[PDB]
């Protein structure tokens, strides 16, 4: 029967790359990928290039219908480029590779002829401070929708897409596990803004940032493989991030493989799995494009929304 989606295997999807030129070195790609991730230039060629093409086709088009409303409203046509910013949402579970996906994507789009100003903002900066989470009793629901200042977030994206010259976002420290006092990420009328986070695709009784997305990605994989990736990476960090004496999780650095597995498995089932099942996965149906990864992190399937 009819469907709003059209599935692709990697063979079918890579052919849609066309002439899209690869503007990324092997060394540039590594400073973009996170611990555990297996993304290489082949994947950036057979997957991210078609995606970048599809995106560029729609930036021009998306611009046409904001112009229709401008024409209808008896309005000018504000400086070119200073068209309406194209907002892209990248969602998915913790440890699924979505932040790398978002970084790679910002890289590819920034290297487009025109030379678009492409900004990337993670929702981390929009988490409530630990003190405020403690107050609302949310220190163990960090990542759940309620642990974010969604008002501020919505104001931020609304501000950018409405044409503001500059919008500020708080900044989150992973080293300190908390929001950084005084820190701000300033976004200045970018041509494209990618917003990456766990629940960005969420919907509700009020207008949310998902309602401002012109395009969205949902990096998917089966729950069991993601837990494995999460646990694996938790263990690997004992010698990277947790090794830092200043790390809020420095006590984990000394855990044994077995002790670390138990700890990582517990956080997964008490925080990350529940959030994935209750809040993140239910948003997957609305994503313009879903990137399905196999147990080895390899993106071998895609689901696109034609309707």
Ligand X SMILES: CC(C)(CO)[C@H](O)C(=O)NCCCO
Question: Pick from 54, 110, 168, 263: which binds a second copy (CB under 8 A)?
Answer: 54
Structure tokens of 44?
């950036």
Q: Exposed, middle or buried, 275 (CB in 10 Å: 0-12/13-18/19+)?
A: buried
**60 lies in the binding site for a second copy (CB under 8 A):** yes
**266 lies in the binding site for a second copy (CB under 8 A):** no
Is the Cβ of residue 198 or residue 304 nearer to ligand X in the bound state? Answer: 198
As a residue count, the chain comes to 307
Question: Pick from 128, 156, 172, 234: which binds Na ion (CB under 5 A)?
Answer: 156
Q: Is 3 annotated as a binding residue?
A: no
Q: Is 143 annotated as a binding residue?
A: no
Q: Residue 67 binds what, of ligand X, a second copy, Na ion, none (CB under 5 to 8 Å, by partner type)?
A: a second copy
Q: Residue 152 binds what, of ligand X, a second copy, Na ion, none (CB under 5 to 8 Å, by partner type)?
A: Na ion
Q: Is 93 annotated as a binding residue?
A: yes
**155 lies in the binding site for a second copy (CB under 8 A):** yes
Question: Pick from 272, 283, 292, 299: which binds ligand X (CB under 6 A)?
Answer: 272
**265 lies in the binding site for ligand X (CB under 6 A):** no
**61 lies in the binding site for a second copy (CB under 8 A):** yes
For residue 39, what are the CA distances in angstroms to 65, 75, 116, 236, 306? 35, 45, 24, 18, 26
Q: Is 31 annotated as a binding residue?
A: no
**271 lies in the binding site for ligand X (CB under 6 A):** yes
Binding mask 24-53 for a second copy (x = CB under 8 A): --------------------------x--x
Q: Is 68 annotated as a binding residue?
A: no
**1 lies in the binding site for a second copy (CB under 8 A):** yes
Distance CA 84, CA 98 (A): 25
Interface with ligand X (CB under 6 A): 94, 124, 142-143, 198, 267, 271-272
Which segments are annotated as binding site for ATP? 92-99
Interface with a second copy (CB under 8 A): 1-4, 6, 15-16, 50, 53-54, 57-58, 60-62, 64-69, 71-74, 84, 155, 158-159, 161-164, 203-207, 211-212, 282, 285-286, 304, 306-307
Interface with Na ion (CB under 5 A): 34, 152, 155-156
């Amino acid at each position: 029967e009819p469907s709003p989606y059209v599935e692709f295997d990697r063979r079918q999807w890579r052919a849609l790359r066309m002439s899209t030129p690869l503007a990324l070195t092997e060394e540039e790609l590594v400073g973009l990928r996170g611990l555990g991730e297996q993304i290489d230039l082949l994947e950036v060629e057979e997957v991210y290039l078609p995606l970048a093409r599809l995106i560029h086709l729609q930036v021009a088009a998306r611009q046409r219908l904001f112009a229709a409303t401008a024409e209808f409203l008896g309005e000018p046509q504000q400086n070119p480029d200073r068209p309406v910013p194209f907002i892209i949402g990248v969602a998915g579970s913790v440890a699924v590779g979505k932040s790398t996906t978002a970084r790679v994507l910002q890289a590819l789009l920034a290297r487009w002829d025109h030379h678009p100003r492409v900004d990337l903002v993670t929702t981390d900066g929009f988490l409530y401070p630990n003190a405020e989470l403690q107050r609302r009793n949310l220190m163990h629901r960090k990542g759940f929708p309620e642990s974010y200042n969604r008002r501020a977030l919505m104001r931020f994206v609304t501000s950018v897409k409405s044409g503001s010259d500059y919008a500020c976002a708080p900044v989150y420290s992973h080293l300190h596990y908390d929001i950084i006092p005084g820190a701000e990420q300033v976004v200045r009328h970018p041509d494209i803004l990618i917003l990456e986070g766990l629940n960005v695709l969420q919907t509700g009784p009020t207008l949310m940032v998902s309602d401002l997305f012109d395009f969205s990605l949902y990096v998917d994989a089966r729950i069991e493989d993601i837990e494995q990736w999460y646990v694996s990476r938790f263990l690997a960090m004992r010698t990277t991030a947790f090794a830092d004496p200043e790390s809020h999780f420095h006590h984990y650095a000394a855990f044994s493989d077995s002790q670390a597995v138990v700890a990582a498995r517990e956080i997964w089932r008490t925080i990350n799995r529940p959030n994935l099942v209750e809040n993140i996965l239910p948003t997957r149906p609305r994503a313009t494009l879903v990137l399905r990864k196999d147990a080895d992190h390899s993106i071998n399937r895609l689901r696109l929304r034609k309707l």
